[PDB]
Ligand binder design. Structure first.
Ligand SMILES: *[C@@H]1O[C@H](CO)[C@@H](O)[C@H](O)[C@H]1NC(C)=O
Lengths: 49, 49
């Protein structure tokens, strides 16, 4: 995902999330929507499965 | 070491007495719980008395 890093400030972990790493060719069963916003430098996340 | 994104707790820092020097330049340590800062840094080294 990157070559290297030098210095930074923020790091967050939250609760663990478990997904499936097996990929198939069948029809979809779930829909996920995400909204990313930036007002006054504040990052906003909106999602609901 | 950079310390950020946490609730500061200096209560155990001044209530103890194992330390020998508790001088705070610039700001006064009598009001520290009412002050909110953006970045907190902490260095560490050993030197003779
Ligand atoms: C990280 O290092 C760069 C030097 O390339 C500097 O410009 C930047 O201010 C540093 N970031 C922080 C948060 O100190």
């Amino acid at each position: 995902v990157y070559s290297s890093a030098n210095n930074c400030t923020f790091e967050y972990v939250s609760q663990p999330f478990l997904m499936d790493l097996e990929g198939k060719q069948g029809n979809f069963k779930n829909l996920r929507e995400f909204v990313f916003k930036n007002i006054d430098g504040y990052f906003k996340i909106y999602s609901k499965h | 070491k950079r310390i950020s994104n946490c609730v500061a707790d200096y209560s155990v820092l001044y209530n103890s007495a194992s330390f020998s020097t508790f001088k705070c330049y610039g700001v006064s340590p009598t009001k520290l719980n009412d002050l909110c800062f953006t970045n907190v840094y902490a260095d560490s080294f050993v030197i003779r008395g």
